[PDB]
Design a protein around this motif. Sequence first.
Motif, short mmCIF file in Angstrom:
data_model
loop_
_atom_site.label_atom_id
_atom_site.label_comp_id
_atom_site.label_asym_id
_atom_site.label_seq_id
_atom_site.Cartn_x
_atom_site.Cartn_y
_atom_site.Cartn_z
N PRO A 98 5.92 -3.69 5.76
CA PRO A 98 4.99 -5.15 5.62
C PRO A 98 3.30 -5.50 5.12
O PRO A 98 2.81 -5.92 4.11
CB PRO A 98 5.70 -6.68 6.19
N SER A 99 2.84 -5.31 6.40
CA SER A 99 1.67 -4.76 5.91
C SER A 99 0.06 -3.13 6.26
O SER A 99 -0.59 -3.16 5.89
CB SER A 99 0.85 -4.16 8.24
N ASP A 100 1.58 -3.02 5.27
CA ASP A 100 0.85 -1.44 4.47
C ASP A 100 -0.59 -1.77 3.50
O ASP A 100 0.07 -2.84 2.69
CB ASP A 100 2.04 -0.87 3.67
N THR A 101 -1.37 -1.21 3.57
CA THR A 101 -2.12 -1.34 2.24
C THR A 101 -2.20 -1.38 0.65
O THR A 101 -0.98 -0.59 0.66
CB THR A 101 -3.41 -1.60 2.39
N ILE A 102 -3.06 -1.58 -0.19
CA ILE A 102 -2.28 -1.37 -1.58
C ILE A 102 -2.45 0.54 -1.83
O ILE A 102 -2.15 0.91 -2.81
CB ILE A 102 -3.20 -2.36 -2.15
N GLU A 103 -3.78 0.68 -0.96
CA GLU A 103 -4.12 2.01 -1.06
C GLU A 103 -3.01 2.93 -0.39
O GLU A 103 -2.98 3.70 -1.02
CB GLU A 103 -5.20 2.11 -0.42
N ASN A 104 -2.62 2.10 0.64
CA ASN A 104 -1.98 3.50 0.87
C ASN A 104 -0.45 3.53 0.63
O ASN A 104 0.38 4.16 -0.35
CB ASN A 104 -0.81 2.63 2.12
N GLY B 187 -7.68 -2.80 -0.53
CA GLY B 187 -8.30 -2.98 0.70
C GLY B 187 -7.31 -3.91 1.54
O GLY B 187 -6.93 -4.46 2.67
N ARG B 188 -6.37 -5.00 1.21
CA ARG B 188 -5.06 -5.97 1.04
C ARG B 188 -4.30 -5.32 1.30
O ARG B 188 -3.38 -4.27 0.93
CB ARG B 188 -5.16 -7.36 0.36
N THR B 189 -2.76 -6.65 2.20
CA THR B 189 -2.34 -5.57 2.32
C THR B 189 -0.85 -6.40 1.44
O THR B 189 -1.10 -7.37 0.60
CB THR B 189 -0.85 -6.05 3.92
N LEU B 190 0.42 -5.63 1.58
CA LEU B 190 1.49 -6.17 0.85
C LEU B 190 1.84 -7.61 1.17
O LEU B 190 1.98 -8.76 0.46
CB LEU B 190 2.98 -5.47 0.64
N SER B 191 1.57 -8.09 2.38
CA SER B 191 2.10 -9.26 3.11
C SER B 191 1.65 -10.05 2.48
O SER B 191 1.30 -11.24 2.34
CB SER B 191 2.39 -9.56 4.50
N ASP B 192 -0.24 -9.93 2.89
CA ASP B 192 -1.50 -10.64 1.86
C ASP B 192 -1.06 -11.05 0.03
O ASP B 192 -1.33 -12.43 0.51
CB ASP B 192 -2.75 -9.81 1.59
N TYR B 193 0.10 -10.23 -0.50
CA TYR B 193 -0.09 -10.71 -1.48
C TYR B 193 1.53 -11.63 -1.29
O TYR B 193 2.01 -11.53 -2.83
CB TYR B 193 0.08 -9.58 -2.23
N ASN B 194 2.18 -11.91 -0.45
CA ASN B 194 3.62 -12.09 -0.34
C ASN B 194 4.29 -11.24 -1.12
O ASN B 194 5.30 -11.83 -1.54
CB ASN B 194 3.96 -13.51 -0.53
N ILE B 195 4.27 -10.29 -0.98
CA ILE B 195 5.37 -9.15 -1.59
C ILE B 195 6.46 -8.85 -0.78
O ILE B 195 5.99 -8.24 0.49
CB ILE B 195 4.90 -7.72 -2.27
N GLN B 196 8.01 -8.94 -0.80
CA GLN B 196 8.66 -9.31 0.46
C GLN B 196 9.89 -7.96 -0.48
O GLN B 196 9.84 -7.31 -1.54
CB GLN B 196 9.85 -10.19 -0.54
N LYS B 197 10.72 -7.47 0.16
CA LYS B 197 12.08 -6.91 0.04
C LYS B 197 12.48 -7.08 -1.63
O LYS B 197 12.36 -8.30 -1.93
CB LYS B 197 12.98 -6.78 1.10
N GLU B 198 12.45 -5.83 -1.87
CA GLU B 198 12.93 -5.93 -3.39
C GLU B 198 11.71 -6.45 -4.83
O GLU B 198 12.48 -6.70 -5.39
CB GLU B 198 14.42 -6.50 -3.30
#
Length: 74
Positions: free
Chosen positions: A19-25, A53-64
């Motif tokens: 969930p907290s992986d960054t966009i760069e990751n 620099g932001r995370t997947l959760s920061d954008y409410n990106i969820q499973k699938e």
Amino acid sequence: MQIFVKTLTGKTITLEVEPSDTIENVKAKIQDKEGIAADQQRLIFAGKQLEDGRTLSDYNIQKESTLHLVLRLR
Ligand SMILES: [Zn+2]
Ligand SMILES: [Zn+2]
Ligand SMILES: [Zn+2]
């Protein structure tokens, strides 16, 4: 979680991320998968341009969730 990344060639990449992986990751993972330099990658989700620099959760990106890969060749 698992997310999908659609590309300019019509391919769909499946990635395993936290969930907290960054966009760069995520871009680093895409680079390994498709051989596209991370610095030329631009990701979009639900019409939102994703910042390195932001995370997947920061954008409410969820499973699938589906992300789109566009490019910046300068
Ligand atoms: Zn971890
Ligand atoms: Zn990670
Ligand atoms: Zn879409």
